[PDB]
Amino acid sequence: KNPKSDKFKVKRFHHIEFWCGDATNVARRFSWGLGMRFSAKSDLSTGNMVHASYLLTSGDLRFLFTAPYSPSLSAGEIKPTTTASIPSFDHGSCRSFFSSHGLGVRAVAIEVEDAESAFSISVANGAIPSSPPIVLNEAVTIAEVKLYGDVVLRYVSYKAEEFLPGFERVEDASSFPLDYGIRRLDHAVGNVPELGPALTYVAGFTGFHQFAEFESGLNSAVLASNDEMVLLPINEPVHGTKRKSQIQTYLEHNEGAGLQHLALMSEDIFRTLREMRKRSSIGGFDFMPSPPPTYYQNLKKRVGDVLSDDQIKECEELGILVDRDDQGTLLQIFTKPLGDRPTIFIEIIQRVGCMMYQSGGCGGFGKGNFSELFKSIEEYEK
Amino acid sequence: KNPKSDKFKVKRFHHIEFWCGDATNVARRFSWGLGMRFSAKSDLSTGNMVHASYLLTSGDLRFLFTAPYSPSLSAGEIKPTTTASIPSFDHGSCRSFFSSHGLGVRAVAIEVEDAESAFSISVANGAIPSSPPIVLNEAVTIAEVKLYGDVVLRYVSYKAEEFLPGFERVEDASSFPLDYGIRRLDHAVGNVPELGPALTYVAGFTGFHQFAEFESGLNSAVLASNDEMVLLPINEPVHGTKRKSQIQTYLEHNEGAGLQHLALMSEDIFRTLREMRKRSSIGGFDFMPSPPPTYYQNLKKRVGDVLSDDQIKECEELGILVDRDDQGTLLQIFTKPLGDRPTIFIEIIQRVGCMMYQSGGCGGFGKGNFSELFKSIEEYEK
Ligand SMILES: CCOC(=O)c1nc2ccc(C(=O)c3c[nH]n(C)c3=O)c(C)c2c(=O)n1-c1ccccc1
Ligand SMILES: CCOC(=O)c1nc2ccc(C(=O)c3c[nH]n(C)c3=O)c(C)c2c(=O)n1-c1ccccc1
Ligand SMILES: [Co+2]
Ligand SMILES: [Co+2]
């Protein structure tokens, strides 16, 4: 059931912004590790005396990395005279965020029809304002409201139809055309202490509806836009369990609520994982430990009608997990944490089924893999 | 003239420590960009609840990357019960350093005979204490005094003859054996507002002597240990010049004095630069713009007795600079800044001559390349 109750017109995920201490080193690491191209910049070389911001792209996926310069470079400026290309940026906020949480996502940005309208309607419906709508070069409007923790939901709307005004396209020489097959952001997941109030708040100001699914440490629910292409799952810990909840570990090391993982859709998850795994120990990303061979033996019964034996063997080579709901099949895998703290990580996913284009959330989010992994673990021990 | 006046026994450069906001991402970037192996760690997985520290090595070169965890993880600890492996570490100091300077070198570490003695003699001779001598597992002693800005000179001495107690050697799977030919730290250069008082201070507490050399924005002098293997050049700006002093730009963007560049000796600078340049646009380091072909035409007259025409052509392919004093010849090249700010960069060098082993500083530090670059630039315009 989809009541299509969005309180304003939402289009797609637009970009994800990391707040960094040094944007250069994180962006270069991510670029090599994920196969994303350097495509735009806003920094000292473009006249920005406030923050360094670097944009990586892969297909429609946009990762933005931002860090503050010394406030002294911009001490003479006021907001009317700012050289920052992202007017919501604040030195104090950024330094406080990174010292509190370490490396992580500050903004989940979605493209909307009218960012000013989205902001007003959101705040009229309970959203906590973070940055009011601001029109950039009469061309783009940006506004921000609180999502959870110190993460903001950023609205962006374009007059037209180049990232943001004041950003410059990156020279071909510095722009190497890496591509490991990642194409878009599928969903972005938050961890909170209490799921109920988080859901009530966000669904309250967006109109996003609960996306239907079908003890492992969590309870979760997924909020979705009208066409279910913007997908925002939220987790809370389950306490008292045998193994300590990974959601609770997140909350402790992150100093509270925040974004837990980003799921990146690949047009060819086997190629993506071959390319990422080649680079794990030479600057890229590590992956969680692979499931036992029992897991892959059990894949024949569960998805033998969707994947060939070879395709299943290819999953085993790369440590890919498989889940299935009543509509489609999901291939997925999780990286180890992206930085020092056991907080944010990345998921790579590919979905098969639900053709009309492919409908959002086809195959679910892999909740069946909690129990299937436990099963296959015990089976393998025997 | 070398009066050999060291006030305590100094051996060699031991390691360089960067203070980071996220040690993981900087270490992985540097590892890929410079061809250094991950060789030791101290972090949550080793019981360190205070800081994440990762060690890269290439030959005898040791780069350490450290960032703080949330203070909450160690809120119950006191210095007697600390889980930090580097007892001089302080959350507040580290966060203040990185917010003030951005990514940069906190510690220039030299190995000495007796770090406690070196500390006492240094402080008796004017050194400003930063961290008193502390004995780690009855095996290693570490102490720190102020060098310039917020950079410390770190003394380390070993009972024996494994980096530091509490660090664990990195598993082979996570340790990929990268090597682009870098072998040791040749020298470490600081920028200060006033050269005179900086020299008087450091030479005062070390006994390091001035190393002899032979308007470009700077004045400089080099301090050296007894065998001239520890080399610490220091720069001050020269004001009023046509082009603004790069030393003054450093001081402004760094919020004052600090380490300007690290010079890394390569056993084969042509291989090092081929390997580094291959990776510049895929996560590694960029290099300063190459000198004009006139520079390389003029190399025949200056070093045609040291490098063949092919070897000179190989320099031109890679943008290498060449200088020569009365004792030897120097090959060198400079990276663009390592992070967001136009502050710290790296120099790659190889020295030819002064065989006895090779004596320290053979060929100088390339001061002749300021004027030779200006000449070759004007010549090329014609
Ligand atoms: C312990 C063995 O490993 C699991 O069993 C395991 N299976 C998973 C299945 C699906 C998803 C997911 O992406 C979503 C689930 N719900 N929604 C909305 C999602 O987006 C995730 C995040 C996991 C996961 O993290 N782990 C997991 C790994 C290491 C430690 C602790 C836990
Ligand atoms: C402008 C054209 O480029 C130069 O002319 C140029 N030549 C150099 C020669 C030697 C050394 C060096 O490594 C030491 C010099 N003295 N000591 C003790 C050293 O270790 C350095 C650091 C440079 C250097 O930075 N630039 C330079 C580059 C870009 C902007 C502004 C300046
Ligand atoms: Co997911
Ligand atoms: Co130098």
PDB file of N, CA and C in Angstrom, chain B residues 8-54:
ATOM      1  N   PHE B   8      73.915  15.967  22.939  1.00  0.00           N
ATOM      2  CA  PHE B   8      73.604  14.580  23.269  1.00  0.00           C
ATOM      3  C   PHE B   8      73.738  13.773  21.988  1.00  0.00           C
ATOM      4  N   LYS B   9      73.830  12.451  22.131  1.00  0.00           N
ATOM      5  CA  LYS B   9      74.086  11.578  20.989  1.00  0.00           C
ATOM      6  C   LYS B   9      72.806  11.388  20.178  1.00  0.00           C
ATOM      7  N   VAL B  10      72.842  11.811  18.919  1.00  0.00           N
ATOM      8  CA  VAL B  10      71.724  11.707  17.985  1.00  0.00           C
ATOM      9  C   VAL B  10      72.091  10.657  16.949  1.00  0.00           C
ATOM     10  N   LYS B  11      71.110   9.848  16.542  1.00  0.00           N
ATOM     11  CA  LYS B  11      71.367   8.786  15.584  1.00  0.00           C
ATOM     12  C   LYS B  11      70.774   9.206  14.245  1.00  0.00           C
ATOM     13  N   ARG B  12      69.536   8.835  13.928  1.00  0.00           N
ATOM     14  CA  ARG B  12      68.942   9.195  12.648  1.00  0.00           C
ATOM     15  C   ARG B  12      67.515   9.672  12.882  1.00  0.00           C
ATOM     16  N   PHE B  13      66.938  10.282  11.849  1.00  0.00           N
ATOM     17  CA  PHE B  13      65.487  10.455  11.810  1.00  0.00           C
ATOM     18  C   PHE B  13      64.820   9.108  12.057  1.00  0.00           C
ATOM     19  N   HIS B  14      63.787   9.106  12.902  1.00  0.00           N
ATOM     20  CA  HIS B  14      63.085   7.880  13.258  1.00  0.00           C
ATOM     21  C   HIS B  14      61.708   7.784  12.616  1.00  0.00           C
ATOM     22  N   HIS B  15      60.878   8.813  12.772  1.00  0.00           N
ATOM     23  CA  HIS B  15      59.569   8.825  12.123  1.00  0.00           C
ATOM     24  C   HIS B  15      59.037  10.249  12.083  1.00  0.00           C
ATOM     25  N   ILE B  16      58.004  10.439  11.265  1.00  0.00           N
ATOM     26  CA  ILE B  16      57.279  11.700  11.164  1.00  0.00           C
ATOM     27  C   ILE B  16      55.831  11.387  11.502  1.00  0.00           C
ATOM     28  N   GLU B  17      55.219  12.170  12.395  1.00  0.00           N
ATOM     29  CA  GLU B  17      53.826  11.927  12.766  1.00  0.00           C
ATOM     30  C   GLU B  17      52.936  13.074  12.295  1.00  0.00           C
ATOM     31  N   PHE B  18      51.937  12.729  11.483  1.00  0.00           N
ATOM     32  CA  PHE B  18      50.869  13.625  11.065  1.00  0.00           C
ATOM     33  C   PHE B  18      49.716  13.538  12.055  1.00  0.00           C
ATOM     34  N   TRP B  19      49.168  14.690  12.429  1.00  0.00           N
ATOM     35  CA  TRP B  19      47.933  14.720  13.187  1.00  0.00           C
ATOM     36  C   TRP B  19      46.787  14.992  12.221  1.00  0.00           C
ATOM     37  N   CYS B  20      45.759  14.162  12.306  1.00  0.00           N
ATOM     38  CA  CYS B  20      44.748  13.992  11.265  1.00  0.00           C
ATOM     39  C   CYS B  20      43.381  14.155  11.900  1.00  0.00           C
ATOM     40  N   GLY B  21      42.361  14.343  11.063  1.00  0.00           N
ATOM     41  CA  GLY B  21      41.039  14.225  11.628  1.00  0.00           C
ATOM     42  C   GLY B  21      40.531  12.802  11.519  1.00  0.00           C
ATOM     43  N   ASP B  22      40.905  12.152  10.418  1.00  0.00           N
ATOM     44  CA  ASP B  22      40.644  10.735  10.177  1.00  0.00           C
ATOM     45  C   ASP B  22      41.951  10.111   9.702  1.00  0.00           C
ATOM     46  N   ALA B  23      42.573   9.303  10.561  1.00  0.00           N
ATOM     47  CA  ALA B  23      43.875   8.742  10.201  1.00  0.00           C
ATOM     48  C   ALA B  23      43.760   7.710   9.084  1.00  0.00           C
ATOM     49  N   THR B  24      42.648   6.964   9.040  1.00  0.00           N
ATOM     50  CA  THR B  24      42.460   5.903   8.046  1.00  0.00           C
ATOM     51  C   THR B  24      42.558   6.443   6.622  1.00  0.00           C
ATOM     52  N   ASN B  25      41.806   7.506   6.321  1.00  0.00           N
ATOM     53  CA  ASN B  25      41.743   7.981   4.939  1.00  0.00           C
ATOM     54  C   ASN B  25      43.046   8.636   4.505  1.00  0.00           C
ATOM     55  N   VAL B  26      43.704   9.365   5.406  1.00  0.00           N
ATOM     56  CA  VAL B  26      44.977   9.962   5.028  1.00  0.00           C
ATOM     57  C   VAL B  26      46.026   8.881   4.831  1.00  0.00           C
ATOM     58  N   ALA B  27      46.078   7.898   5.741  1.00  0.00           N
ATOM     59  CA  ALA B  27      47.082   6.845   5.598  1.00  0.00           C
ATOM     60  C   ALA B  27      46.872   6.061   4.312  1.00  0.00           C
ATOM     61  N   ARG B  28      45.620   5.767   3.952  1.00  0.00           N
ATOM     62  CA  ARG B  28      45.420   4.973   2.737  1.00  0.00           C
ATOM     63  C   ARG B  28      45.786   5.766   1.486  1.00  0.00           C
ATOM     64  N   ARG B  29      45.463   7.063   1.479  1.00  0.00           N
ATOM     65  CA  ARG B  29      45.853   7.933   0.376  1.00  0.00           C
ATOM     66  C   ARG B  29      47.369   7.987   0.238  1.00  0.00           C
ATOM     67  N   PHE B  30      48.068   8.300   1.332  1.00  0.00           N
ATOM     68  CA  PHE B  30      49.529   8.369   1.295  1.00  0.00           C
ATOM     69  C   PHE B  30      50.148   7.044   0.878  1.00  0.00           C
ATOM     70  N   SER B  31      49.606   5.926   1.373  1.00  0.00           N
ATOM     71  CA  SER B  31      50.175   4.617   1.047  1.00  0.00           C
ATOM     72  C   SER B  31      50.178   4.377  -0.458  1.00  0.00           C
ATOM     73  N   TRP B  32      49.041   4.630  -1.105  1.00  0.00           N
ATOM     74  CA  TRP B  32      48.934   4.453  -2.547  1.00  0.00           C
ATOM     75  C   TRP B  32      49.759   5.488  -3.303  1.00  0.00           C
ATOM     76  N   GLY B  33      49.749   6.735  -2.827  1.00  0.00           N
ATOM     77  CA  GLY B  33      50.417   7.816  -3.540  1.00  0.00           C
ATOM     78  C   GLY B  33      51.937   7.757  -3.483  1.00  0.00           C
ATOM     79  N   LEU B  34      52.497   7.265  -2.381  1.00  0.00           N
ATOM     80  CA  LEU B  34      53.940   7.254  -2.173  1.00  0.00           C
ATOM     81  C   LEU B  34      54.549   5.861  -2.228  1.00  0.00           C
ATOM     82  N   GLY B  35      53.727   4.817  -2.303  1.00  0.00           N
ATOM     83  CA  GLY B  35      54.215   3.450  -2.314  1.00  0.00           C
ATOM     84  C   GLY B  35      54.787   3.027  -0.980  1.00  0.00           C
ATOM     85  N   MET B  36      54.034   3.240   0.091  1.00  0.00           N
ATOM     86  CA  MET B  36      54.455   2.826   1.415  1.00  0.00           C
ATOM     87  C   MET B  36      53.525   1.730   1.919  1.00  0.00           C
ATOM     88  N   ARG B  37      54.111   0.765   2.630  1.00  0.00           N
ATOM     89  CA  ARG B  37      53.410  -0.400   3.183  1.00  0.00           C
ATOM     90  C   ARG B  37      52.789  -0.053   4.527  1.00  0.00           C
ATOM     91  N   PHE B  38      51.582  -0.561   4.782  1.00  0.00           N
ATOM     92  CA  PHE B  38      51.024  -0.536   6.135  1.00  0.00           C
ATOM     93  C   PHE B  38      51.787  -1.539   7.001  1.00  0.00           C
ATOM     94  N   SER B  39      52.422  -1.085   8.084  1.00  0.00           N
ATOM     95  CA  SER B  39      53.252  -2.016   8.839  1.00  0.00           C
ATOM     96  C   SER B  39      52.931  -2.132  10.321  1.00  0.00           C
ATOM     97  N   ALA B  40      52.276  -1.148  10.940  1.00  0.00           N
ATOM     98  CA  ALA B  40      51.881  -1.302  12.331  1.00  0.00           C
ATOM     99  C   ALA B  40      50.630  -0.476  12.590  1.00  0.00           C
ATOM    100  N   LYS B  41      49.891  -0.853  13.631  1.00  0.00           N
ATOM    101  CA  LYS B  41      48.714  -0.095  14.034  1.00  0.00           C
ATOM    102  C   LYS B  41      48.577  -0.061  15.550  1.00  0.00           C
ATOM    103  N   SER B  42      47.912   0.992  16.029  1.00  0.00           N
ATOM    104  CA  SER B  42      47.471   1.107  17.411  1.00  0.00           C
ATOM    105  C   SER B  42      46.114   1.792  17.348  1.00  0.00           C
ATOM    106  N   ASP B  43      45.067   1.093  17.756  1.00  0.00           N
ATOM    107  CA  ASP B  43      43.703   1.572  17.535  1.00  0.00           C
ATOM    108  C   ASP B  43      42.768   0.702  18.369  1.00  0.00           C
ATOM    109  N   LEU B  44      41.457   0.846  18.143  1.00  0.00           N
ATOM    110  CA  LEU B  44      40.468   0.094  18.913  1.00  0.00           C
ATOM    111  C   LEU B  44      40.745  -1.404  18.891  1.00  0.00           C
ATOM    112  N   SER B  45      41.184  -1.933  17.746  1.00  0.00           N
ATOM    113  CA  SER B  45      41.437  -3.366  17.659  1.00  0.00           C
ATOM    114  C   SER B  45      42.641  -3.798  18.483  1.00  0.00           C
ATOM    115  N   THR B  46      43.507  -2.871  18.881  1.00  0.00           N
ATOM    116  CA  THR B  46      44.643  -3.213  19.728  1.00  0.00           C
ATOM    117  C   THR B  46      44.448  -2.748  21.165  1.00  0.00           C
ATOM    118  N   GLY B  47      43.241  -2.315  21.530  1.00  0.00           N
ATOM    119  CA  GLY B  47      42.949  -1.902  22.885  1.00  0.00           C
ATOM    120  C   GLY B  47      43.153  -0.432  23.169  1.00  0.00           C
ATOM    121  N   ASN B  48      43.489   0.363  22.165  1.00  0.00           N
ATOM    122  CA  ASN B  48      43.681   1.798  22.334  1.00  0.00           C
ATOM    123  C   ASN B  48      42.326   2.485  22.185  1.00  0.00           C
ATOM    124  N   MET B  49      41.789   2.994  23.299  1.00  0.00           N
ATOM    125  CA  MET B  49      40.505   3.687  23.321  1.00  0.00           C
ATOM    126  C   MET B  49      40.648   5.187  23.137  1.00  0.00           C
ATOM    127  N   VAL B  50      41.864   5.669  22.898  1.00  0.00           N
ATOM    128  CA  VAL B  50      42.177   7.089  22.906  1.00  0.00           C
ATOM    129  C   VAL B  50      42.421   7.616  21.499  1.00  0.00           C
ATOM    130  N   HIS B  51      43.325   6.985  20.758  1.00  0.00           N
ATOM    131  CA  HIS B  51      43.672   7.472  19.428  1.00  0.00           C
ATOM    132  C   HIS B  51      43.845   6.308  18.462  1.00  0.00           C
ATOM    133  N   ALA B  52      43.572   6.587  17.186  1.00  0.00           N
ATOM    134  CA  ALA B  52      43.851   5.669  16.088  1.00  0.00           C
ATOM    135  C   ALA B  52      45.174   6.091  15.457  1.00  0.00           C
ATOM    136  N   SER B  53      46.137   5.164  15.372  1.00  0.00           N
ATOM    137  CA  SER B  53      47.454   5.480  14.831  1.00  0.00           C
ATOM    138  C   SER B  53      47.889   4.406  13.845  1.00  0.00           C
ATOM    139  N   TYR B  54      48.241   4.821  12.628  1.00  0.00           N
ATOM    140  CA  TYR B  54      48.642   3.876  11.583  1.00  0.00           C
ATOM    141  C   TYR B  54      50.001   4.247  11.025  1.00  0.00           C
TER     142      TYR B  54
END
